[PDB]
Amino acid sequence: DLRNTPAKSLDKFIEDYLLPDTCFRMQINHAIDIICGFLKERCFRGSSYPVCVSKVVKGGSSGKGTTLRGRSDADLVVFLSPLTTFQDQLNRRGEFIQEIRRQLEACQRERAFSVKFEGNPRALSFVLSSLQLGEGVEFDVLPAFDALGQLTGGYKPNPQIYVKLIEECTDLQKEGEFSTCFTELQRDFLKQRPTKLKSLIRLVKHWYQNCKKKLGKLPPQYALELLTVYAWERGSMKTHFNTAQGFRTVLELVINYQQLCIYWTKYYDFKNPIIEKYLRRQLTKPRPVILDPADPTGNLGGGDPKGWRQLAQEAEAWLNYPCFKNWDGSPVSSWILL
RNA sequence: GGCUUUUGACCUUUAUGC
RNA sequence: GCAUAAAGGUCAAAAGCC
Ligand SMILES: Nc1ncnc2c1ncn2[C@H]1C[C@H](O)[C@@H](COP(=O)(O)OP(=O)(O)OP(=O)(O)O)O1
Ligand SMILES: [Mg+2]
Ligand SMILES: [Mg+2]
């Protein structure tokens, strides 16, 4: 029980309940190998029109290394050559959702594996079960347009790519509805972080699931991850820190949701006039404001004022729980941010 | 400090797709 | 070169146990 776990033993809680088991990371690497192989080697050979898979991006928990044991998805982004514009991705993702299912079910007719389902939807979702899986791994398969292309790190994406995105997102009314194209940037924001930050994120995520079971409608889990990176960057910066403090710090950010204005300039900045103007309007929006580091149009925590109202009421309640109290019963401190 | 596990960086391969 | 999985090597971060 996270609620009754002493603050001192939070790292032990993460170690044997949250950190991936070797069995788990073996279960996942295999399940991915099956589908990556499937997508590349059979799914689109039989071409009424040449469909080429340029990439299959491992994203979400798996890509970042923020997986909860036995509870994390496998999120695979499929970059297709026929998808050439963002609107192409919007207009044609559904065709490809339906085709991939059709191929998977054909591969289920052959006894290669089993699969359980489940423009309009964003992803194909299913539980894959092979011989060496059985209990099955859950999947989200995301067809997407390669807006970034192949790229060497240590360099920002071309700002023109973001000019296109912003113009396209506002010509239409779907801001942040193309975050998928920038999954590699979403990933590399967390993937290279110090180890214990990912651990802390795992802890925050499990706490979040325990609120989802209780409250139902809630802000995206990604928002809470970004809050944790924010809490870490502003209140610590050490590879070695106090988990109970960081956990309390994130909870208080959630409480301070009516004041949050958070953004990073890792993949975009204000040098380009069109981006500069858009970003500045974004920081103006009602609180909280949590910009996706990979997508300036992606405002997390922008959807539900009620969702944060409830999440803050649970976080407030949690501050009295044994996990924020030391041996002597004194409260754990929270970091003072920047 | 010892043992182990998790998460990464870089380097070299193998299969596969582009 | 990029992407997935695997194999070898070099380095590192943290955690569990002692
Ligand atoms: N940018 C976003 N905006 C709104 N919702 C999002 C966004 N990104 C993800 N989600 C939601 C939709 C999905 O149904 C749900 C699952 O995301 P997911 O890919 O599984 O992230 P994750 O892998 O890091 O968390 P998990 O621990 O569940 O695996 O989160
Ligand atoms: Mg996932
Ligand atoms: Mg998912």
Side-chain angles (χ1 to χ4, degrees):
Chain A
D1 205 339
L2 181 54
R3 178 176 302 182
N4 305 92
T5 305
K8 170 204 170 178
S9 292
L10 281 178
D11 284 318
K12 184 168 183 57
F13 185 93
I14 307 175
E15 171 81 14
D16 55 36
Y17 294 152
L18 301 190
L19 294 193
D21 185 304
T22 308
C23 181
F24 181 74
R25 70 190 254 272
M26 286 193 65
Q27 280 179 9
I28 280 262
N29 294 349
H30 178 243
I32 292 179
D33 191 12
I34 302 303
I35 301 300
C36 279
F38 159 83
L39 289 170
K40 280 145 50 182
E41 292 161 31
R42 188 202 156 99
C43 191
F44 296 114
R45 285 190 174 178
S47 308
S48 192
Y49 63 108
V51 178
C52 293
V53 176
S54 65
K55 281 182 304 186
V56 178
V57 186
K58 184 178 70 176
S61 285
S62 302
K64 306 163 180 176
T66 66
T67 46
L68 303 188
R69 181 199 306 171
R71 289 173 170 88
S72 283
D73 264 332
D75 305 290
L76 263 41
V77 188
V78 216
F79 289 96
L80 303 174
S81 56
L83 302 181
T84 316
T85 75
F86 291 115
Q87 193 182 350
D88 255 334
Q89 180 180 164
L90 218 204
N91 295 340
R92 286 166 53 79
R93 61 175 179 222
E95 293 184 17
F96 293 101
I97 299 296
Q98 191 182 19
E99 181 66 20
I100 294 167
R101 172 201 267 262
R102 170 204 173 191
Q103 297 298 324
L104 286 169
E105 297 194 77
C107 283
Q108 190 187 25
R109 197 162 68 84
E110 316 171 359
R111 321 218 296 118
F113 46 62
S114 182
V115 53
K116 193 166 191 172
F117 307 100
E118 298 78 23
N120 189 11
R122 198 178 293 101
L124 210 228
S125 299
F126 59 92
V127 190
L128 174 73
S129 45
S130 163
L131 291 82
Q132 307 185 18
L133 294 185
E135 78 281 323
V137 185
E138 294 178 349
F139 271 93
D140 292 323
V141 171
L142 285 291
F145 146 68
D146 195 9
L148 302 161
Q150 304 176 201
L151 184 57
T152 300
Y155 286 102
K156 284 191 176 69
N158 206 280
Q160 291 295 330
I161 305 175
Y162 285 130
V163 175
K164 277 281 302 181
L165 174 70
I166 288 166
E167 286 179 338
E168 226 70 20
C169 286
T170 5
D171 274 10
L172 279 48
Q173 214 69 37
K174 4 236 71 67
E175 283 99 335
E177 217 244 339
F178 298 110
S179 317
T180 339
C181 313
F182 308 94
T183 314
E184 292 146 291
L185 307 183
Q186 289 189 319
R187 171 198 76 220
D188 291 327
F189 189 81
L190 275 180
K191 224 182 167 208
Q192 287 77 24
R193 298 294 182 171
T195 315
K196 199 165 183 173
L197 177 48
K198 303 189 182 197
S199 291
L200 180 60
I201 286 177
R202 269 179 269 260
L203 184 63
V204 176
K205 286 175 57 182
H206 172 247
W207 169 85
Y208 174 76
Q209 312 285 13
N210 256 247
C211 294
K212 225 182 185 183
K213 65 162 192 185
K214 194 171 187 175
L215 304 167
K217 316 172 189 174
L218 276 186
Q221 197 180 230
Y222 190 24
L224 277 297
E225 281 195 354
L226 289 175
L227 248 48
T228 311
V229 182
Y230 183 82
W232 182 78
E233 284 182 338
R234 302 310 186 109
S236 181
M237 261 274 194
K238 311 299 185 182
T239 55
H240 172 29
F241 62 89
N242 193 274
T243 307
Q245 294 194 337
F247 187 21
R248 198 189 194 135
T249 300
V250 171
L251 288 212
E252 286 175 347
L253 282 168
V254 176
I255 300 169
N256 309 321
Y257 71 97
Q258 325 215 52
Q259 285 180 344
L260 304 190
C261 176
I262 296 176
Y263 76 97
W264 290 268
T265 58
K266 185 170 184 169
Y267 303 115
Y268 50 78
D269 55 339
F270 304 88
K271 292 179 186 174
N272 189 274
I274 303 179
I275 299 184
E276 182 189 36
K277 177 164 299 180
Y278 186 76
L279 284 179
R280 286 191 140 228
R281 272 191 167 187
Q282 290 287 85
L283 308 177
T284 286
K285 312 274 268 304
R287 266 65 165 149
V289 170
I290 316 173
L291 264 31
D292 196 328
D295 190 348
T297 68
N299 178 26
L300 300 124
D304 302 310
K306 309 178 195 306
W308 290 90
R309 172 85 192 280
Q310 290 182 356
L311 190 60
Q313 92 195 331
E314 258 277 334
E316 186 95 79
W318 270 72
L319 304 178
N320 290 322
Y321 294 164
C323 60
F324 300 109
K325 296 176 179 176
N326 310 269
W327 307 262
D328 49 317
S330 64
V332 300
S333 299
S334 36
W335 303 328
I336 196 76
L337 303 174
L338 211 94

